[PDB]
Subunit: 528 residues, 2 copies
Amino acid sequence: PRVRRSVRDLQKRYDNGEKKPLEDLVRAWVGIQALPPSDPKSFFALGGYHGEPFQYRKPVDALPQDDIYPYWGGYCNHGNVLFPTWHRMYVYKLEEALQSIVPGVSMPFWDETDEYTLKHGIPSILTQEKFELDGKQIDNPLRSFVLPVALSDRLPGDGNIYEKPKGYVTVRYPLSGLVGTPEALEQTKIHNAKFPLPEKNTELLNSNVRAWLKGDSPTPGDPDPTRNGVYAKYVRCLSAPNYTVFSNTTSASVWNSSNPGLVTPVESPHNDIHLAVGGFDYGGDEIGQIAGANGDMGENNTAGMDPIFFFHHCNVDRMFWVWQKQTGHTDRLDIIRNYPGTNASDSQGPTPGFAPGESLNLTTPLNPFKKASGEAYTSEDCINIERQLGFTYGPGSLDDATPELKSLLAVPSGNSTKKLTVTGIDRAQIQGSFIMKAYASVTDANGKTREYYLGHKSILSRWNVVQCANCLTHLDIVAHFPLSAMPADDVPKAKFRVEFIHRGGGVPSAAKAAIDKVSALQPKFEVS
Amino acid sequence: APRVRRSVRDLQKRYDNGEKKPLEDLVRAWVGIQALPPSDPKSFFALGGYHGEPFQYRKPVDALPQDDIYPYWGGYCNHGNVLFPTWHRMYVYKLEEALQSIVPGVSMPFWDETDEYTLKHGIPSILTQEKFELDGKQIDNPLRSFVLPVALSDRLPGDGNIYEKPKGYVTVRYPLSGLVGTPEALEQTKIHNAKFPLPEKNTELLNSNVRAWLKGDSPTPGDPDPTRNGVYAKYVRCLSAPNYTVFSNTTSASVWNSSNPGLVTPVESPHNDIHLAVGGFDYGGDEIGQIAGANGDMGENNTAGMDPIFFFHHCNVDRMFWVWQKQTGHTDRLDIIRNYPGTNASDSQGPTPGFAPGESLNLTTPLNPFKKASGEAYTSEDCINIERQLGFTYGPGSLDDATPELKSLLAVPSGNSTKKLTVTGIDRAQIQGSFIMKAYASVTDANGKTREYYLGHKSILSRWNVVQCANCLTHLDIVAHFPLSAMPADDVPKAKFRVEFIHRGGGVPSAAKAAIDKVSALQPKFEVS
Ligand SMILES: [Cu+2]
Ligand SMILES: [Cu+2]
Ligand SMILES: [Cu+2]
Ligand SMILES: [Cu+2]
Ligand SMILES: [O]
Ligand SMILES: [O]
């Protein structure tokens, strides 16, 4: 049974004399990036499966505003119960291509919650410019990917924000990569000119990733993860009561509207990391509403084209394995039938070959992945990673439940165990990912006022190219926040607010309308 | 001074003892409403029309390939969503307003489907009777059926479909059939209805079928004796629904029953059963075959609205809503679990006109096409309290008290199973018309011999569809829950379960063979909780 390890581990081993592990990893990645785009083991093909390049439903795209519905032209499952197992298979399938080059090689995980990441950000092997392979200096293949062919719909006369030219290089925070219209490219050029130094950019990113994990501005001593950060949310997720609500944000959201307390699906901190690496400043609501760093990882469209997507998803799979171990679901999973999250119409809408209204279950095929026999993989094929897929997860953060982790999530004596529901944000238009941050102020009769931060919600979403003015996806926003930061007697005095950080329509001609709508929103606040 | 909606059976008792001015007012009002011209939004044609047909279409959705198409509803009524109880509340209210425009002050009464009369004798004859004595001349009874004053027609050149019904079409109930819009359908309807030429006999068959439904078995003489499986038991169970969301509709109740121990019955469920009883399904149909050929107006949502008994039945559904409102403390407040199945326009029948696929339904959303004095759309907010907001109440009637009897009818007998059966493995079914599922269990002991248990019924009240590919019908995943309270707890793990279907056979002889084969080829999947 092969072991997948912490990549920080492979890097320490490299710096201490033992280099074949990191060198094997790099060699295999060089190998798959060099395969041609038409080869289904090429990194371009593999990154392609997630999102773009898309398959369209032209009859749906022409529907009027009252009849149109959202769908997904990529194969990835998001906001549904196939989120964990589809990505499980996806990483496994890219490991298979790596093995094409270097037999027996294992895909490590970026351990997002280890001590190194809390204190120093992303392991440098994922950001370094260069690497020593066969005593030669090569370009580090994990830093980014150059597109061998264009992402293009090849429609004569047309260019949209989905499209990226041949030679396009993937980018992370703080850079922008939306280049398919003249407007987006121009704004991208202006935005990137504000971040011209690669070394400074790497620092900015490491600092944002630490701030996301912490849940507040990074401290220079020991890490001190608060209850609101991505550390806390990954911990909370290992307590999800059942697979259905562990698995996705649609299921967990309705569970949290219908049951006491709060569950966190693994998809939730996973969304957090996307936005962190992919262009959102945790502190962004102290500055403005618009996150202009349109990086590949920040939306599902081209996230799969960035190598770090697989190191991150390797850690997401890890967390799913750990949840399986700690809750005894190593061999069997269950789905609440017809629960929100089990429908192809949920969230991103249906993937290719699915229809509106169609159920999703453990037998549903995880396209486009196929076995040696040519038969479609299903969730049944990949529940026990040791038994059916032939690999395990080495040791890393969070794999044991402990007193320290229990006291992190726990309500300070005399603080509210209640929860806040934010709604009244009905039928908002979706262009790109966005974040919500909730706060509370309380004012005494004597006039003193305290301020409370209640936490964040990351909606990982997509770019959308539509055929009419008002034909974007509509979404009801619903968000639940703990009140644990507040003392219980302040809750009835409280005045709540939310701040959004969003894409502003993707381009400058869409920005003022986006800002006006968000500023106009009058959310409803409900205390349990 | 809240007006009093009464039992129509009570109004007939009083007519027979010489107090005739209440039932004469009702009938007078229904005559006046049926004689208004069709363009008048108070004409029974327009009121009946609001529920379903005449349809508003979404021509670009009708044109979609089979992978992209989705169901939608061209009528205004809400079914399988949280607006079912409140939309229909306002529909009955608005019909009542129309009646009042003909006879000031009149109250729309309710067919008490669960009183001792209905259990023993079926429908009160005031609703089935051919004739009625008003102002000296004996008139046609407007409550027994309705004549269309204009066609239900899409007026398309060269086309005719099962939605369409000619001017002069008369609504029908079990045992008659009423699909007439293609030649095959009209032929079958003529042949079928000619087997049933006597009105008196037809009424007896209807009353017998209604009584069978209510009971859960063949109607027995004397003490009606409802079982745990009948529509009586189901209405009783719906008053224990833990919240409004799952009380309100079949979609919410279904997901609840998949995700909580025990069994909830929404009010829409017994309501569905009455529709099918009156609109063409024989409770004991599964002893005869799979097809229910009596295509009555009440049996599908398409034209049910045009049969006057719709409003007597729904007046009782509203009463049951009120009774649940009374017994659970929601006379003044309702709430909806946010994003729960049943809170989306995409659910069940699909979006009504105006609405968009993923759009949410709450106590705020307009109950089209109903409108107050101020031209502003009604909402559920406007009709939570019937006493304070609408100025009417429900007089006494069956089931309005919790009662030892009711308890030990739904009670699990001693040693019998408290477990639940879940029926599954029936995915992507094509829907043409309403259908019924009936669940059974056999148990062979070691001594070779076999017992049979009836576990109950599930009515899917649905719709006739007209589509533009063979493969393009609405697809439904069928999930059903049945109690095992009928069988002894130690018989359960030995049990071999089965379901039978009674369905419309595609509506026409030419679709019947295909439909029978598809059903016979289902391999349902069974699970015990
Ligand atoms: Cu993904
Ligand atoms: Cu991801
Ligand atoms: Cu209805
Ligand atoms: Cu009805
Ligand atoms: O993702
Ligand atoms: O209905």
